[PDB]
Symmetry: C8
Subunit: 130 residues, 8 copies
C-alpha cells in the first residue's frame, strides 16, 4: 500500500496504542512499510493527530510491559543482558513519548553559601552583551 | 467488557491499592483488558483520579518489595543481574508513580565565583 | 490480623526503627501482612505519624548498616554483586526516607561567560505566554 | 560531482527523509561524496535548511529502529553488547538530530531550605 | 542501659571522633545499643550537636581510609570488586556526613543562546 | 618540515575536515609531526582560522562515522568493547568540537513546591558579601 | 608520639605535599598514628593552616600521578580494575581537596521554550510561605 | 636545584607546551623535582601564568592523543580496559586543564509547568 488509506492508518493507531512498536506493526499481513507510514504522517493531519494519541497510549502500555520483561527474564547471562537492553530502551523512549509523565523527576533544595540565603550581587553591564 | 462501568473501576482501584499490578488485575475473569482500562481513564476524569491514588498506594508496596528482591537474591551471577534489573526497573517506575515522594533528591548549595556572591550583570 | 491493633502497630514501628524492612517484619510470628499494614496506615493518623518517626529512625539505622554489608561481603563474584545491589538499594531508599539528610549534596559555583559575571538580557514578552 | 546542484540536493534530502543514511546515499553512482555534501551545506543556506528537516525525518525512523535492535538482539554475550552499543549510539545521535523532541526530559521541583521558600539576599 | 546519660554520651562522641564506627562503639560493654543512642539524639538537642561534630571528625578519618582501601586492594577480580564497593559506599556516606566538605563540586558557566547573554522575557 | 608551509597546512585542513584525526594525518608521507602543527597554529592566524573551520567539518564527518563503528563491530567481546571505546571517545570529542551542535540536550520543566509556583523570598543582605 | 610535636607535623606536611596519603605517611618510622594527627589538627591552628597548604600541594601531585597509574597498569583484568579504582578514588578526592581547580566543569547554554527567550511569569504569593 | 630560576622555568613551559608531561620533564638532568616546580609556582605569580598557558597547550596535544589510544587499542579484554582507563583519565584531566574548552557542554531548554511560562511567586 502506497496511497493513504484511513482504515489502515486507524488499525496502525490501535496496534500502537496497545504497546506494539511501529516496525513490528508494519510486518503484519497487508500493512504498509515504515517509510510509507511516515509519508502518510507527513501529509495527513488527521492521521498525525490520531497517531499522537496512540503514542501516549503506547507509552502507558509499555510502562506496564517493563516490569514483565524484567521479572520474566531467563536467568542466563546473555538473556538477562538482553532483557536489560530491552528495558533500558523502553525507559528512554517513554520519556520522549510523554515527557511530562515519564521524564526524570528531581526535587532540588536550593540554598546559599554555608546553608544560608543565596547571595546575589547585581552590577551594571561591564561589556556590550546586549 | 468494554463499556465504562463504575464499581468495576472502583474494584480495579482497590485491587491496585492492595499492591496488585494492572496486568494481573486484567487477567481476572470479567475484567476489561489493558487497552480498555486506559480508554476509560482517557474519557473519564473521575476515574483518572481514583486510579492515580491507587497508583501511589501501589508504589508504596513496590518500595518495600525492592528490599526483598535485593536481600533475597540468589547468589549466582545471572540471578543477581536479574535481581538488579528488577530493582532498577522498580526504582525508575516509582519516581514516575509518585514523583514528589520517590523522585531524586538533591540539595544544591549555590555560590558565586571563588565562593563569593553570585555575580549578575543585567541590561 | 485484619482489624487495626495499636499494640501490633507499635511493635511494627519499633522493629522498623531498628532498620528491619517491612516485608521482613511482616514475616514474624503473628504479624499482619503488608497489605493489612498499608490499610491500617491509610485509616489511622496515629499510626501514620508514628510510622513517619519510625521511617526516619529506620533510615539512620540503615545508614550504619551499609558499611557492614560492604565490609563483610564474601569475596566471590556473585556475592559481591549481591552486596552491591543490597547497598545500592539502601542508598537509593535512604534519600527517599529522609531527603534532607540523605539526598545528594552538590555545591554549584555559578559564573558567567568567560568566567565573568552572568549576563542577563531582559525583554518584553514577544508572545502571549501569560 | 562537486559543483553545487539543486535537484540533486533535493534528491539527497528525499533519500534521507525516507530513513537512508548519508553514508549510503553518497555511495550511490552520481552522488557527491560526503565532504562535498557538507561543503555545499556550508556555502548554501537554503540547503542547510531542507537537509535539517530531512534529518529530523530520519531521526523519526531511527527512533523506531532502536526498538527492533533491542528486541531482536541475538542472545549471545558479544551480540547483546553490540546491540547495546548500536542502540546507545542511536539514542545519543537522536538527541542531536532533534533536540526538542529527543533530548533528555527532566522536571525539577525547586524548593528552598527545609522545603520552605527559596531564600535570596541581594546587594 | 537505656536512660539518657551525659558523660557516656560524651564518651561515645570521643570514640567516634577518633574514627571508631557507632556499630563498634555500641558493641562495648556498658554501652547503649544502636537504637538507644538514636532515641537519645532525638529527645536531646545538646547531644544531637556534639554527635554531629564527632560525625564530621569521623568523616575526616574515613576520607583517608579510602586511599588505603583502593591502594592495598588484593589484585583478584572479586577482591577488587569488594574494595570498589567499600570505597563507593564510603564516598557516598562522606557526602552525607559533611555535605559542605565532601559533597559534589561543580562550576557551571551559565551563558545564553549561541553564547550570548541569557535572554529572559517577563510578564 | 619545521618552517610554516601554507600548502601543507591546507592539506592538513582538508584531511581533518573529512574526519581523520590529527595524529593519523601526521603519520602520512611528508607531513609535519603533531608538535610542529601545534607550533604553526600558535603563530599563524590564517591557519588557526582555517583549522577552526576544518574542526567543525571534522565533527560532522565523525557524527556519521559513529554509526558505522557500532554497526560493523566484530561480535567478539574485546572487539565490541573496543568499538564502544572508539564511539565513546568520539561522542565526547564531538561535544567539544562543536558544543552548540553536539553538546547534551536537556529540557527542564521548572516547577515549585508541590507542583505549584516557584516560591522565592527576598531579604536584605545579612552579611557583607558585596 | 602523643604530645604535639611541630617538627613532626612539618614533616607530615612535606610528605603529604608530595602526594603521599596520610595513612601511608603515618606508617613511616617514628610517625604518629592517624588519630594522633587528627587530634593535633583539632588543637593547633598553626598545623591546621600548614596542613591546608599541604593538601593543595598534595592535590597537584596526585593530578600528575593519575596518568602514571593508568598508563603503567598491568594488562591483566584484575590489575586494570585495581588501577581504575585507584584512579577513580583520586579523581573523587581531588575535587574535594581543591574544588575550584578540580571540581567538575560544565558550560550550560540556557534557552527558553522552543529555543526562544526564557519565559517567566511572576505572581503574588498565593500561600503563606514567608 | 631548588632555587627559583627563570629561563629554566621558561624551558619547562616550552617542554610542556610541546606535549611533554611534567613528570618526564622533571626526570631530565638539571631539572628541579616535581615538588620544587610547585613551590615555585606558589611563590611566583609570573610563573603560575606562563605555566597555565603551557598547560592549555599540553591539553590540546592530549586531546588528539585520546583518538590514538582508542583507535589503536589492542583487541584483548584487559588491554581494551586499560585503554579505556587511559582515555577516561585524560578526558577527566582535560576538563580541568582547560575548563572553557574541554568542560562538559549542555544546552538546557528551561520551561515552566506543562510547557508554559515558568511560574514564580515572590514575597
Amino acid at each position: 500500500p502506497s496511497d493513504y488509506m484511513p482504515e489502515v492508518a486507524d488499525d496502525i493507531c490501535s496496534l500502537l496504542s496497545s504497546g506494539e512498536s511501529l516496525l513490528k506493526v508494519c510486518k503484519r499481513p497487508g500493512m504498509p512499510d515504515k517509510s510509507t507510514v511516515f509519508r502518510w504522517l507527513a501529509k495527513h493531519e488527521d492521521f498525525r493527530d490520531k497517531y499522537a494519541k496512540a503514542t501516549e497510549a503506547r507509552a502507558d502500555s509499555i510502562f506496564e510491559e517493563i516490569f514483565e520483561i524484567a521479572d520474566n527474564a531467563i536467568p542466563d547471562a546473555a538473556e538477562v543482558a538482553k532483557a536489560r537492553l530491552r528495558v533500558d530502551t523502553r525507559k528512554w523512549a517513554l520519556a520522549r513519548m510523554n515527557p511530562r509523565k515519564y521524564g526524570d523527576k528531581v526535587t532540588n533544595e536550593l540554598v546559599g553559601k554555608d546553608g544560608g540565603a543565596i547571595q546575589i550581587e547585581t552590577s551594571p553591564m561591564s561589556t556590550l552583551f546586549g
